[PDB]
Symmetry: D2
Subunit: 295 residues, 4 copies
């Protein structure tokens, strides 16, 4: 036997950081969950019990905290790039660092119409994420994403004209509910190293904002012919608005809301134009994916 | 043997309802999860295989949907009361209906600064709940609550002066993070029946709003001596603002954020006044509860 | 305002203990999650910022570990009783301790037909639990339970003869799937204190074994007329086999498996006697409860 | 813009099947969760609202059930291959089918020492899975796996000799707990189509059995130098025992059990050789991966 691939590290490293402005008294908090997995000349730790090549995962954990202490943790694309760069520069035999960061929301509270200097609310489980792959001699590959963005529209979704054969029972519709959990990823042009990532720092927050804005507005305003057609429109717009992105990926469940025929009860009309009460379905669900790039 | 207590019904009944204004085009959606459990003269279904006394749980499910079709589903205190009343009035041998409703958030989207007529976002997993116990000859007992309200403050929490003995290692502190998931319940005066519940309908949304407002403002503004002392202040205010509430209950975890001593690394100062990076602890957690009533 | 009720402590305290036999080399492990909440003369910690009455929850945590170090952690009824007794005896002003323990399974592995001395497998998420309420001047109240025991039988469940009215659509059946997650609780006679609990120690493991055995055999062998009738049979048997139990409680979901009519496709017969492929339903679910005591 | 990749279908399709032997009365059940995603000449459904190319996900669902009705659902490698083959053969413009199956355990109950003909228990959340990629003109690629196999050993794990620098605080140890959740995957040689998969049917159950056996015995018997070294031993053995497997992948968390120093309390000795009570850590966790192939 031989090792074909190997990576190892520390997962589920929860990190909080606070910034305190001594002048204004305004505090700002950041919270993330971090995974760092390393690759390199480590095969002998698997095949020959040679632990000498192991940077202990506990030390990886320590390094995450130390890096957060000595560097900005925002935008997460930058933090991840600093962190992955550290491992491949520090350790001659480590040749790649794979950094995944999940950012948790802590939105400043408004109390009596005014922003509070140190109190925050988790306004949803919606995450902002990065995957940063730092590979020695191959620069830094970053995928940014938003996930867990749960939406519903109560009309202006349609689904008709699909293939019909002996496996088909679904009725065509010109008016249905559409609800999804948005997972949207934008893949950046390869960066040559940390300096190039630093040169683009403002674009990271701005492009997350654009992606979120475009998703919400396109969902709200598209009289959707299908999930396929709506999500493509989202991806085209994001690509048009940030030339440093190479591709946009969406992964969208179709979380079904079924009509409930109640006509068996006193001839109650609850279908079609009279549909008011629905049964949300936990499973199954459609799952629609695409990756959109530049023509 | 003998049956000492028995209740049965349908749990996890997911319900959506839409309201469509034909004039304005504005749609409003509601989504809940409902449980109804019945009690009554049903012991023979357990002891003698006598299913004749069983209102099938599938029929309970049907009834939930039919009731949502024919009645407002908001405020949930009203919907629950209509639903529980139905079972005890319809079935001579059913003498209590226990209705639990979890309301899920669907907040209208703002697109380009303006409210969208039919598009919604789940802005958090925060729930608004009711427990409505409709008991024949004993009226309607309602407990209302908010849950899953996750908050953090980065300073203006303290904890000192607690008992110290041979089991104590915790250092006193005058400045710590405080984070919790708020579960807050307000218990209404008994209502004599559905008419009395109807007479108070506006108070239900208004008192949920007050409870939420009071929780957030008291959390943000109290330089907390302890979770015990802060939550008591919340409960006193809610009781002062709604005389139809008899008690207020809070159940608050203390979700710990631990300092990380990094002085072993290049003498890095990350404790006390220099504390910037923390390790959120998933477990264990403090759990603090109280029920506050009128003196 | 006034405090009507108050309890506080440490939740989600994960505990492992190992026993090592120096003679045989056989190690045995135990793993639990513990919650301890205290009551007593603590109201001033809520109303007057008086932390002097607070036994810190961090100290409660320490005490859990110290108690596990100095005492057996099995059976959990005993461990919980020792732990709760400690708090009410140690602290004059603490008058009740509420101890909840979830025991996690670590079953010894069989390797090549022989028990391994120190290797274990989690054979399911089935838990063994206790709730131990130690109340000064009122002894020790123990509820023992098993939970998360997931079972299915593919025939020899029926459901017919239930009430039929204008809300009913469910067809009567003489042959259906029955699947549930068993939550079964046995409530012990009040014990006067720790000595009495100690006097009964062997009965705790034996009665958990009986309850589990009775549940499984009654589920497997009863040609069930309803969940109500089957669970009652389980409770009667447990009461007959342990006179120190006062009541038995079951809480059983009916996790529905729906037939799928496929006759629209090439006249495929998949209902009734020809039913082979079913759709398990995640929600809704029946929920059936009863508490059985001595006649 | 242009579509670079696209796949769509139905996820979370829960399926039960029963086999009834009319002779013996012995029933056998199978339960799975299925995802099927299709690829092909479908880009116009995204770019031009052309739903004509869409095989509706609802029809995909129907097809899963119909396929389970007309074919064996075991071994899941076969079922997945039949299912994916169907889509690419039935639809000229569908060129790949990606089938993921999670198999849930339903182990026959033993009642009074004898197997019961129709009663089953979920003995753990351990899953048996397949990923079957059926690609027109490229055969059938199958990855088989077991996941959620949770184990612990209380000694005969070590970790010493790892790299030590200014980021390192972890003490070397010659005796620690090792606990993990095993995710193990074996990747089959490409099959040319369904006939070749059928030719190997017995090897699927046998190789899952070998992988499970090898995992458990190697975990129990290896005095582990590291997770890296133990998992490599597992993978080498599986490759030696099934020549139709090309690679074996393991992904193992190191679920930490921390010693608890209690010497601050009455000089209690609970570390090193005296370590009896430990604190299981929910997070962070080591994460160790490797892919082993043939030299
Ligand atoms: Na390097
Ligand atoms: Na009645
Ligand atoms: Na006391
Ligand atoms: Na094809």
């Amino acid at each position: 036997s031989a090792v074909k691939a190997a990576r190892y590290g520390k997962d589920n490293v929860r990190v909080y950081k606070v910034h305190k402005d001594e002048k204004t008294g305004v505090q700002t908090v950041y919270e993330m969950t971090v995974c760092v997995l390393l690759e390199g000349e480590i095969e002998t730790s698997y095949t020959k019990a040679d632990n000498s090549v192991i940077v202990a995962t506990d030390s990886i954990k320590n390094t995450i905290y130390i890096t957060a202490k000595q560097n900005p943790v925002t935008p997460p694309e930058l933090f991840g790039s600093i962190l992955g760069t550290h491992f491949i520069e520090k350790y001659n035999h480590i040749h790649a660092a794979h950094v995944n960061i999940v950012c948790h929301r802590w939105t400043r509270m408004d109390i009596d119409g005014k922003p509070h200097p140190h109190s925050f609310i988790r306004d949803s489980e919606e995450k902002r994420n990065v995957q940063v792959d730092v590979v020695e001699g191959k620069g830094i590959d970053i995928k940014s994403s938003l996930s867990g963005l749960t939406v519903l529209k109560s009309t202006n979704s349609q689904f008709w004209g699909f293939l019909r054969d002996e496996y088909t029972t679904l009725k065509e519709t010109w008016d249905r509910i559409l609800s999804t959990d948005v997972d949207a990823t934008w893949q950046w042009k390869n960066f040559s190293g940390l300096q190039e990532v630093r040169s683009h720092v403002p674009k990271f927050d701005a492009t997350w904002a654009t992606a979120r804005e475009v998703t919400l507005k396109t969902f709200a305003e598209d009289n959707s012919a299908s999930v396929q057609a709506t999500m493509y429109k989202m991806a085209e717009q994001i690509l048009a608005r940030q030339q440093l992105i190479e591709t946009v990926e969406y992964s969208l469940p179709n979380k079904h809301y079924f009509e409930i025929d109640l006509s068996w009860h006193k001839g109650l009309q609850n279908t079609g134009k009279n549909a008011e009460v629905f049964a949300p379905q936990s499973d199954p669900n459609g799952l629609i994916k695409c990756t959109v790039g530049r023509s």
